Amino acid sequence: DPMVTLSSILESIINDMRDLPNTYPFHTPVNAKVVKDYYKIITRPMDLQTLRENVRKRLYPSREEFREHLELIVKNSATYNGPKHSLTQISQSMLDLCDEKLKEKEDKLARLEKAINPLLDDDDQVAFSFILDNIVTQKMMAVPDSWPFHHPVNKKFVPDYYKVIVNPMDLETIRKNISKHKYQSRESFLDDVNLILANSVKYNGPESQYTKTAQEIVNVCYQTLTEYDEHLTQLEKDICTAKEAAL
Numbered sequence: 001d002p003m004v005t006l007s008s009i010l011e012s013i014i015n016d017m018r019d020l021p022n023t024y025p026f027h028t029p030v031n032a033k034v035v036k037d038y039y040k041i042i043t044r045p046m047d048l049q050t051l052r053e054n055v056r057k058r059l060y061p062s063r064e065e066f067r068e069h070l071e072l073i074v075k076n077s078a079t080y081n082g083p084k085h086s087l088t089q090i091s092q093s094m095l096d097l098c099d100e101k102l103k104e105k106e107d108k109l110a111r112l113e114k115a116i117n118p119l120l121d122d123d124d125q126v127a128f129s130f131i132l133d134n135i136v137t138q139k140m141m142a143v144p145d146s147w148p149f150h151h152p153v154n155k156k157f158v159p160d161y162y163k164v165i166v167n168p169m170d171l172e173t174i175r176k177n178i179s180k181h182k183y184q185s186r187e188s189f190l191d192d193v194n195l196i197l198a199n200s201v202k203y204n205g206p207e208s209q210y211t212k213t214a215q216e217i218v219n220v221c222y223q224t225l226t227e228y229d230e231h232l233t234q235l236e237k238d239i240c241t242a243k244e245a246a247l
């Protein structure tokens with residue numbers, strides 16, 4: 001079972017990260033009854049124990065989902081402790097080692113990932129994802145003053161954001177989803193794109209300039225999808241055939 005082999009590789013990387021110097025503060029979850037403001041600042045807690053348990057729950061079908069959770073450890077430290085704090089440097093040493101090990105095992109990991117999910121090797125899925133990523137970076141992120149929507153909100157800087165917005169979305173998250181080939185057609189992609197605009201209506205109001213910018217992001221997405229409609233329709237058809245074939 002390639003998921004078992006993959007999981008064993010990921011656990012071995014966790015073992016190697018745990019062994020780096022001074023890493024213990026990251027081995028287990030932050031104790032929010034000692035660090036009483038932790039959840040007022042951090043939205044997505046992560047640590048090596050939780051990461052290992054998730055590997056064992058078979059939550060990571062690829063390098064990328066694993067690495068994304070590992071990177072939260074660093075991002076959270078950068079936010080809470082500071083970008084140059086020794087704890088943030090220590091967390092970064094873990095991520096650097098992970099990247100070394102993933103580099104070394106890249107061909108084996110690719111083989112396992114494609115055995116787990118054959119669409120990662122499908123040329124139509126890859127071409128479709130490439131087009132979506134170019135729409136995001138060249139059209140959507142090029143909208144003037146679109147920066148509020150480029151990344152997840154950092155609760156440190158907007159402390160009530162996630163009390164209001166419980167289903168957040170942003171363009172970086174969409175790009176990460178594209179890189180993982182989460183979207184097999186425009187319908188699921190547009191659900192996430194529209195969530196950006198819905199969240200702006202809710203948090204900022206329907207007449208806010210933030211919402212006008214978000215509306216422009218959505219409108220240039222529709223305009224560009226319409227321009228590429230013929231090609232995208234063919235890719236979506238061939239992806240469906242590949243999806244059904246893998247059965």
Ligand SMILES: C[C@@H]1COCCN1c1cc(C2(S(C)(=O)=O)CC2)nc(-c2cccc3[nH]ccc23)n1
Pocket residue numbers: 147148149150151152153154155157158161200203204210
């Ligand atoms: C709430 C507002 C409008 O609705 C969309 C998301 N918005 C963001 C997003 C971000 C992020 S950030 C830096 O937190 O990563 C994702 C890019 N920051 C700020 C922000 C931060 C600090 C002071 C501020 N004054 C006005 C906006 C603002 N607002």
